[PDB]
Write a protein that binds this ligand. Structure first.
Ligand SMILES: CCCCCCCCO[C@@H]1O[C@H](CO)[C@@H](O)[C@H](O)[C@H]1O
Ligand SMILES: CC(C)C[C@H](N)C(=O)O
Ligand code: NA
Length: 492
């Protein structure tokens, strides 16, 4: 079985798992919609009461399973809870990352295609001295709409450009070239290059954005809006719903990806300090880097109220239309846009390999496929299924809700219950702390066993016909994966 080569490479690979497209596209929108600073306090609390303990739990479950040759949750749940229903629940740890990848790699290809076009200067050229922002936003809006082929009429049909489709082919090929080299020579080797690159690009963009100023505002105004606490909105449950959901999304928790990565950590190697360092690096890249780019740039040009209204228009609109349009009003702004989309591409690529590895690990561990065949069959499934996302409008929305939103939160609660309630709280705690360079504070034993599951349960309770096409297909994917698990059990 493969193993990570270096402790640093393991850290950077896990950091790249978490630091992805959602950290930079979705997190600023969610922070701005919920009052900025009024969102950061619950998010930080959700980082301490949900993100940190669930990260340690997934690290421990992964290393525990990998010790017996199993990297995915159908087998790992059954090891922790010897029950046929544990295998059925474990299927979600393959279905969630696969379905997410079926649209995630497509969005990743957007950022690559935009990086190419912005580097060569093939971008919309708004007329100078524009006294109206719409005359600048509209060329970039039509630019994205032509790239992905937004429907012009009532038919929910997307029409991707030829360039967008070719770039999606290249993007799949790049993911395959990394994954086919394996854990150490592929994912780990790429992480050691991509994470320093990602960090340097983000720091540069933060500095450049921080210098932005118009008569409508400054970047410091946006930072003040994002970091000034508002204790009145602590009463609102919706802020906690958004904060805990963002904790799942930014940390790649509940996607089965952390577990599979941790399955290549050796039996004796640390997971406490290593996991804490990976999660801390991700939060630095999320709240400090990602949150300090697009929202402060928007506030600098539009003011807080208009920037919030812009953020309500969605992650795609802010990331692919509004931010490049704002950049186009500055010297060297086309090159600044290229850096933004190159940052997004490396963040996406380090995350998409992470959510495609669970299916690869299942085929290797349980069906005994070679790495080459496992990676190629996984890529074929993702590439084929992605045509539903590329051509059917709102198919991505349905996949992102059922697998990317409902699925990840329920799966995080499920894995915690299996590990800390069914398998055994004391046994789980000793397995988490075994071989650690530092020990988890004893207070977290009662956070994992009582506070975290009660937190998730309470918040979950407080929480067109074409949609059935996507539902019918992802339900079929689940049935397909259940059949593969069935075939594995008949061979074992
Ligand atoms: C399972 C259904 C198979 C359908 C194969 C569709 C392959 C995509 O087809 C391509 O898509 C592009 C637009 O997106 C066009 O630019 C190309 O001309 C077209 O060949
Ligand atoms: C692996 C991905 C589905 C999630 C990742 N944390 C991101 O920000 O994109
Ligand atoms: Na990433």
């Amino acid at each position: 079985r493969e193993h990570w080569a270096t402790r640093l490479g393991l850290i950077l690979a896990m950091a790249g798992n978490a630091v992805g497209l959602c950290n930079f596209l979705r997190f600023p929108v969610q922070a701005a919609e919920n009052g900025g600073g009024a969102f950061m306090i619950p998010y930080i609390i959700a980082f301490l009461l949900v993100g940190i303990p669930l990260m340690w739990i997934e690290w421990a479950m992964g290393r525990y399973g990998g010790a017996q040759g199993h990297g995915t949750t159908p087998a790992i749940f059954y090891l922790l809870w010897r029950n046929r229903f544990a295998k059925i629940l474990g299927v979600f740890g393959l279905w969630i990352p696969l379905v997410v990848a079926i649209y995630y790699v497509y969005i990743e290809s957007w950022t690559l295609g935009f990086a190419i076009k912005f580097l060569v200067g093939l971008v919309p050229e708004p007329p100078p001295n524009a006294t109206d922002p719409d005359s600048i936003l509209r060329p970039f809006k039509e630019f994205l709409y032509s790239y992905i082929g937004v429907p012009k009429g009532d038919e929910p049909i997307l029409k991707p450009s030829l360039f967008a489709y070719i770039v999606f082919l290249i993007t799949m090929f790049i993911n395959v070239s990394i994954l086919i080299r394996g854990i150490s020579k592929g994912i780990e080797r790429f992480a050691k290059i991509a994470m320093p690159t990602l960090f340097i690009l983000a720091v540069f963009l933060v500095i450049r954005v921080f210098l932005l100023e118009t008569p409508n505002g400054t970047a410091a105004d946006g930072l003040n809006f994002l970091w000034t606490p508002d204790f009145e909105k602590l009463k609102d449950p919706g802020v906690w719903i958004a904060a805990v959901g963002q904790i799942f999304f930014t940390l790649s928790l509940g996607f089965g990806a952390i577990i599979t990565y941790a399955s290549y950590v050796r039996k004796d190697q640390d997971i406490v300090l290593s996991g804490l360092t990976a999660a801390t690096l991700n939060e630095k890249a999320s709240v400090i880097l990602g949150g300090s780019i697009s929202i402060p740039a928007a506030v600098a040009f539009f003011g807080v109220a208009n920037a919030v209204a812009i953020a309500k228009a969605g992650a795609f609109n802010l990331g692919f239309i509004t931010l490049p349009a704002i950049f186009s009003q500055t010297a060297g702004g086309t090159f600044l846009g290229f850096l933004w989309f190159f940052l997004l591409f490396f963040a996406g690529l380090t995350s998409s390999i992470a959510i495609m590895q669970p299916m690869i690990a299942f085929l290797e561990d349980e069906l005994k496929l070679s790495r080459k065949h496992a990676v190629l069959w996984t890529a074929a499934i993702v590439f084929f299924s992605a045509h539903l996302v590329m051509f059917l409008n709102k198919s991505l929305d349905e996949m992102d809700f059922w697998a990317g939103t409902i699925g990840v939160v329920f799966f995080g609660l499920t894995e915690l219950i299996i590990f800390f309630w069914i398998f055994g709280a004391d046994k789980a705690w000793e397995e988490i702390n075994r071989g650690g360079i530092i020990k988890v504070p004893r207070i977290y034993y009662y956070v994992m066993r009582y506070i975290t599951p009660a937190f998730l349960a309470v918040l979950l309770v407080v929480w067109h016909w074409t949609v059935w096409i996507t539902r019918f297909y992802i339900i079929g994917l689940f049935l397909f994966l259940t059949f593969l698990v069935f075939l594995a059990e008949r061979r074992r």
